[PDB]
């Protein structure tokens, strides 16, 4: 829904208040997005590199 990024999706146990869209921790690093269809919180992990 307009927020683009790259990574791997997974399930998350964090709980959102009924009005937020997506969370973050620091420095504009998205860490939790909820799909509008399911209203379930997901989680984003950067793809492995090295």
């Amino acid at each position: 829904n307009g927020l683009t990024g790259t990574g791997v999706l997974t399930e998350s146990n964090k709980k959102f208040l009924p009005f937020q869209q997506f969370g973050r921790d620091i420095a504009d690093t998205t860490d939790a997005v909820r799909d509008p269809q399911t209203l379930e919180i997901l989680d984003i992990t950067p793809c492995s590199f090295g």
Binding site: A27, T29, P46, F49, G50
Partner: protein
């Protein structure tokens, strides 16, 4: 911790350093300055 940068682990683990310190301490208890 992964945003475009990496952190490398140390070559010497903590256990090896503890073992070196124990060896030094036992040596200085028993022999003194002779083992240097």
């Amino acid at each position: 911790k992964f945003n475009g940068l990496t952190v490398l682990p140390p070559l010497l683990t903590d256990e090896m350093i503890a073992q070196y310190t124990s060896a030094l301490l036992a040596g200085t208890i028993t022999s003194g300055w002779t083992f240097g």
